[PDB]
Design an enzyme around this catalytic site. Structure first.
Site, PDB file in Angstrom:
ATOM      1  N   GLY A 115      12.431  -3.277   2.364  1.00 59.34           N
ATOM      2  CA  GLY A 115      13.836  -3.106   1.614  1.00 59.34           C
ATOM      3  C   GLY A 115      13.998  -4.619   0.685  1.00 59.34           C
ATOM      4  O   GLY A 115      15.307  -4.932   0.653  1.00 59.34           O
ATOM      5  N   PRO A 133       0.744  -1.250   0.011  1.00 57.60           N
ATOM      6  CA  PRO A 133      -0.125  -0.111   0.129  1.00 57.60           C
ATOM      7  C   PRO A 133       0.690   1.353   0.167  1.00 57.60           C
ATOM      8  O   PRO A 133       1.928   1.227   0.899  1.00 57.60           O
ATOM      9  CB  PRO A 133      -0.721  -0.041   1.374  1.00 57.60           C
ATOM     10  N   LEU A 134       0.598   2.297  -0.670  1.00 57.37           N
ATOM     11  CA  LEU A 134       1.248   3.329  -1.174  1.00 57.37           C
ATOM     12  C   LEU A 134       0.364   4.614  -1.361  1.00 57.37           C
ATOM     13  O   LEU A 134      -0.159   4.748  -2.228  1.00 57.37           O
ATOM     14  CB  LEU A 134       2.158   3.319  -2.248  1.00 57.37           C
ATOM     15  N   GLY A 180       7.169  -1.776  -2.118  1.00 57.35           N
ATOM     16  CA  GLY A 180       6.508  -0.490  -2.265  1.00 57.35           C
ATOM     17  C   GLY A 180       7.204   0.415  -3.091  1.00 57.35           C
ATOM     18  O   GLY A 180       7.021   0.529  -4.080  1.00 57.35           O
ATOM     19  N   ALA A 200      -3.723   3.450   1.643  1.00 60.98           N
ATOM     20  CA  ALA A 200      -4.517   3.655   2.797  1.00 60.98           C
ATOM     21  C   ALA A 200      -5.572   4.555   2.315  1.00 60.98           C
ATOM     22  O   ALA A 200      -5.504   5.780   1.732  1.00 60.98           O
ATOM     23  CB  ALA A 200      -3.795   4.428   3.775  1.00 60.98           C
ATOM     24  N   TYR A 257      -0.978   4.737  13.169  1.00 53.70           N
ATOM     25  CA  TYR A 257      -2.539   5.099  12.915  1.00 53.70           C
ATOM     26  C   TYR A 257      -3.117   4.493  13.906  1.00 53.70           C
ATOM     27  O   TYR A 257      -2.968   4.075  14.932  1.00 53.70           O
ATOM     28  CB  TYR A 257      -2.769   4.841  11.474  1.00 53.70           C
ATOM     29  N   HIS A 301      -5.434  -1.593   8.030  1.00 53.37           N
ATOM     30  CA  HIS A 301      -4.165  -0.865   8.603  1.00 53.37           C
ATOM     31  C   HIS A 301      -3.974  -0.565   9.884  1.00 53.37           C
ATOM     32  O   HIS A 301      -4.638   0.257  10.492  1.00 53.37           O
ATOM     33  CB  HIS A 301      -4.122   0.464   7.844  1.00 53.37           C
ATOM     34  N   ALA A 307      -0.962  -0.533  11.390  1.00 56.15           N
ATOM     35  CA  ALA A 307       0.568  -0.343  11.349  1.00 56.15           C
ATOM     36  C   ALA A 307       0.803   1.384  11.532  1.00 56.15           C
ATOM     37  O   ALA A 307       0.057   2.025  11.274  1.00 56.15           O
ATOM     38  CB  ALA A 307       1.168  -0.884   9.945  1.00 56.15           C
TER      39      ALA A 307
HETATM   40  C1  LIG Z   1       5.099   7.115  -0.637  1.00 54.80           C
HETATM   41  C2  LIG Z   1       4.939   5.977   0.398  1.00 54.80           C
HETATM   42  C3  LIG Z   1       3.741   5.919   0.856  1.00 54.80           C
HETATM   43  C4  LIG Z   1       3.077   4.834   1.725  1.00 54.80           C
HETATM   44  N1  LIG Z   1       1.991   4.755   1.992  1.00 54.80           N
HETATM   45  C5  LIG Z   1       1.550   3.646   2.695  1.00 54.80           C
HETATM   46  C6  LIG Z   1      -0.091   3.530   3.090  1.00 54.80           C
HETATM   47  O1  LIG Z   1      -0.656   4.045   2.543  1.00 54.80           O
HETATM   48  N2  LIG Z   1      -0.026   2.246   3.774  1.00 54.80           N
HETATM   49  C7  LIG Z   1       0.959   1.755   4.369  1.00 54.80           C
HETATM   50  O2  LIG Z   1       0.590   0.614   5.266  1.00 54.80           O
HETATM   51  N3  LIG Z   1       1.967   1.791   4.209  1.00 54.80           N
HETATM   52  C8  LIG Z   1       2.594   2.887   3.480  1.00 54.80           C
HETATM   53  N4  LIG Z   1       3.910   3.089   2.942  1.00 54.80           N
HETATM   54  C9  LIG Z   1       4.768   1.911   3.618  1.00 54.80           C
HETATM   55  C10 LIG Z   1       5.085   0.977   2.269  1.00 54.80           C
HETATM   56  O3  LIG Z   1       4.018   0.253   1.983  1.00 54.80           O
HETATM   57  C11 LIG Z   1       6.473   0.157   2.673  1.00 54.80           C
HETATM   58  O4  LIG Z   1       5.975  -0.723   3.795  1.00 54.80           O
HETATM   59  C12 LIG Z   1       7.714   0.667   2.870  1.00 54.80           C
HETATM   60  O5  LIG Z   1       7.766   1.643   1.957  1.00 54.80           O
HETATM   61  C13 LIG Z   1       8.717  -0.309   2.844  1.00 54.80           C
HETATM   62  O6  LIG Z   1       8.709  -1.184   1.616  1.00 54.80           O
HETATM   63  P1  LIG Z   1       9.625  -0.806   0.704  1.00 54.80           P
HETATM   64  O7  LIG Z   1      11.216  -0.825   1.263  1.00 54.80           O
HETATM   65  O8  LIG Z   1       9.504  -2.037  -0.496  1.00 54.80           O
HETATM   66  O9  LIG Z   1       9.408   0.482  -0.074  1.00 54.80           O
HETATM   67  C14 LIG Z   1       4.280   3.945   2.076  1.00 54.80           C
HETATM   68  C15 LIG Z   1       5.559   4.074   1.847  1.00 54.80           C
HETATM   69  C16 LIG Z   1       5.948   4.950   0.829  1.00 54.80           C
HETATM   70  C17 LIG Z   1       7.286   5.175   0.256  1.00 54.80           C
END
Ligand SMILES: Cc1cc2nc3c(=O)[nH]c(=O)nc-3n(C[C@H](O)[C@H](O)[C@H](O)COP(=O)(O)O)c2cc1C
Length: 357
Positions: free
Chosen positions: A295, A23-24, A316, A56, A179, A174, A176
């Site tokens: 990561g 989720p992003l 992400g 989210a 929130y 969510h 985590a």
């Molecule tokens: C731009 C951005 C927005 C994010 N929005 C959310 C979100 O909406 N919900 C959530 O649970 N995590 C959110 N995250 C966390 C990501 O889902 C992810 O857990 C985190 O970036 C680590 O994974 P990665 O290293 O593959 O990016 C967000 C991260 C980024 C970079």
């Protein structure tokens, strides 16, 4: 020999691979916080994911904490999300909606009637929050009355039912990143003295009641939960994360959920003295599908799937910049570099214009 490209049975859904789009938040909702055709293009571009978890999405107006994030509480929002789920399905993908309530991570300017954000306990976050007039100090949130907790659960239940009408394949709760549900989970943010504070069973009670309500709307195999045991994001930290999160992982088993999704904080190893919550602890405790995140790469993801440490791996940042991330990982292609300056807000640039192979 299973790897990142192996199929997976997630309840009734056949996933073509083990690669999940995490989720992003992209903060590109339209008027009324409604999704629109550009958002549908963005998710449609990423439909090669084994599963997409959409950004989210606030279940109720008070659950918004940042400008221009989409909601799932109004009929107009359901219709805009339907555009997205129609496109994803036309492109052969599968998509769950992540259901959000920000709790104290908000500002009165984003709340109905300019009210205080709500929380388990009246503790102002540190620092500043973005509003429609720019950045401002956070305020101290109002601690919910015991009698108001059923209304929170009901807001999540309605959000889930609206997600079903929008044509999603499932939902993720969510719980985590500090929130509302996480604010209740962790003893740093929860100082309550009712049945929703104190012992871990009490601090988990909101999560468990929200999950029970949502599994009365969706088949349980279409409901996931996200936790982030070692994040410190949004000022939300627990003093005994191993005990707290291990308890939660086990307590979720009764619901026969789709999955448990763990965001493994990137700084966990270097912060403190080592990782205090090994994901293997949660893997052993939770009897269903585990999604891991934080990561990951082709080589790290293949490793965790081969040695039974997780079933699915969510990406992400790499999915921001690589719409065809599965194909690129499969053939060891170059990966496009994500540009943080366009993560949030704006239009097509930094959103739908990252190139395909
Ligand atoms: C731009 C951005 C927005 C994010 N929005 C959310 C979100 O909406 N919900 C959530 O649970 N995590 C959110 N995250 C966390 C990501 O889902 C992810 O857990 C985190 O970036 C680590 O994974 P990665 O290293 O593959 O990016 C967000 C991260 C980024 C970079």
């Amino acid at each position: 020999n299973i790897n990142l490209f192996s199929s997976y049975q997630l309840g009734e859904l056949e996933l073509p691979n083990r690669i999940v789009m995490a989720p992003l938040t992209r903060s590109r909702a339209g008027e009324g916080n409604v999704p629109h055709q550009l958002n549908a293009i963005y998710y449609g571009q990423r439909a090669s994911a084994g599963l997409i978890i959409a950004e989210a999405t606030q279940v109720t107006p008070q659950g918004q904490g940042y400008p221009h994030t989409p909601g799932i509480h109004s009929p107009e929002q359901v219709a805009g999300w339907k555009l997205v789920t129609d496109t994803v399905h036309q492109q052969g993908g599968r998509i769950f909606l992540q259901l959000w309530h920000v709790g104290r991570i908000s500002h009165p300017d984003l709340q109905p009637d300019g009210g205080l954000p709500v929380a388990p306990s009246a503790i102002a976050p540190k620092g500043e929050v973005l509003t429609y007039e720019g950045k401002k100090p956070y305020v101290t949130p109002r601690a919910l009355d015991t009698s108001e907790i059923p209304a929170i659960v009901e807001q999540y239940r309605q959000g889930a039912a609206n997600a079903l009408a929008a044509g999603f394949d499932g939902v993720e709760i969510h719980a985590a990143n500090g929130y509302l549900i996480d604010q209740f989970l962790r003893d740093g943010t929860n100082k309550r003295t009712d049945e929703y504070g104190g012992a871990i069973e009490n601090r988990a009670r909101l999560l468990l009641e929200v999950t029970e309500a949502i599994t009365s709307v969706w088949d349980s195999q279409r409901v996931g939960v996200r936790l982030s045991p070692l994040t410190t994001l949004n000022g939300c930290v627990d003093s005994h994360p191993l005990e707290t999160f291990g308890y939660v992982a086990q307590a979720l088993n009764r619901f026969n959920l789709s999955y448990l999704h763990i965001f493994e904080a990137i700084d966990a190893d270097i912060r403190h003295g080592g990782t205090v919550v090994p994901t293997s602890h949660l893997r052993d405790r939770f009897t269903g599908t585990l999604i891991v995140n934080g990561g990951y790469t082709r080589e790290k993801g293949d490793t965790v799937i081969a040695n039974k440490a997780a079933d699915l791996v969510a990406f992400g940042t790499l999915f921001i910049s690589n719409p065809d991330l599965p194909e690129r990982l499969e053939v060891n292609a170059p990966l496009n570099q994500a540009d943080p300056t366009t993560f949030y807000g704006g239009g097509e640039k930094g959103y739908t214009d990252y190139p395909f192979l």
